[PDB]
Design a protein around this ligand. Sequence first.
Ligand SMILES: N#Cc1cc2cc(CN3CCC(Nc4ncnc5sc(CC(F)(F)F)cc45)CC3)ccc2n1CC(N)=O
Length: 466
Amino acid sequence: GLKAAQKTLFPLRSIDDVVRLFAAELGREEPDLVLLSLVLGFVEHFLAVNRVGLTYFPVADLSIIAALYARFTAQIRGAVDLSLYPREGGVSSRELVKKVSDVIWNSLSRSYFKDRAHIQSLFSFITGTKLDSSGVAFAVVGACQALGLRDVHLALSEDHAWVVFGPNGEQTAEVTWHGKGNEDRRGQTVNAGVAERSWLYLKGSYMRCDRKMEVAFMVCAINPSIDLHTDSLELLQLQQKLLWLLYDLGHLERYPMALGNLADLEELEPTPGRPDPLTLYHKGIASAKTYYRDEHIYPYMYLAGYHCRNRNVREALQAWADTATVIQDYNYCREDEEIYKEFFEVANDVIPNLLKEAASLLEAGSQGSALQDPECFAHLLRFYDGICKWEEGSPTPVLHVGWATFLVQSLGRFEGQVRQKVRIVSPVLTFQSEKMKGMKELLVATKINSSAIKLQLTAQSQVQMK
Ligand SMILES: N#Cc1cc2cc(CN3CCC(Nc4ncnc5sc(CC(F)(F)F)cc45)CC3)ccc2n1CC(N)=O
């Protein structure tokens, strides 16, 4: 509107007043995305971007928020003439969605760093004419709600955002960019990406948000970071409370990554009487299994990261083996580079550092070490198996000799007598990839044959002539 009933909690003088606003909005038929995003971006601005003058909480006065809201609705209503796009069926057309996407896109500053913090909200859009990639998608959905287009909803993968709309909410449209130096496909469907079985489009098992999930998205999108070394405790507390509000109302049921975010917040500062972080990570994974065919990677990455921080080697390896078991049934496509980067960092940095510490601790007499547990060696092997299987049939390869050195080093952290105890069947482990099936021979020698490993992992045809 803003409607009279939306205004009665103002001014917001505290974290808990913001929470009350969210609770009130979530109790309405259609929570007001524009109002909520402006409020979050306002408080984020004054708690993370510019804390000059801060004494407790940046009071959000109705006059200030209403004026921001008016700037948004005036910009959208002036630019989008709904009479030019007649709505058949109480649903929107592709042309109308593209128009809204154009209006947001064309409003943005000509030149800015797209990867900077605090450019996610409508507050950034109105005051700085800056949005990040998924911020543009959110803004298009907020603009469509403001226009009365109840069918337009946010669609989310693990690295991208677009909208669904139209009859039965069955249409898809690109509304923002993806990555850096990819050609924009705004206006198009996502069918080619679903059909090529890329991770970016999750084989079609992406999130199709309702309004409540779009609220959850903006809450996950809060960025408490003040700088590299410093987070806003106020914004961490706000995000954590809003996530629990959403959780209690049922709106994180179909949002795996939000559960992982909340688990991470609880690890940092536990809320008395709430589920442990581990419980929450496992609920994230359950969500992915239940609603998204177990086709998501981050629920397992979140779990693994928690075990890695707690130096739980065994359970970190199991979770990373599970991440690889998901990825194996995708094709590695152009525009999947963020998930390649994650797997690369885990294989080539995180696991080696973890195993190096484990090796030192073993030398010092640790008992029950992952390095003496053949089931842990099997998890490491299943992690590599899934990466190798991922690469099979992909249009772009994954592995290269830069991975092989770390594989040899990681295998060698397990003594031969531990490695011997895994039974590789055609602990028991079965390999899905042809690369690992050929490597089986090499995996039990007391001294691993480094060169042969390297040849098998990279499928390098020849050794040096001279
Ligand atoms: N092990 C481990 C591990 C844990 C872990 C945790 C993270 C944390 N990120 C996990 C993903 C999370 N992303 C999200 N969280 C909620 N909602 C959304 S919707 C969306 C798509 C977009 F942006 F809208 F286009 C992304 C996304 C942002 C936080 C990143 C890499 C991680 N790793 C891999 C690593 N390299 O350490």
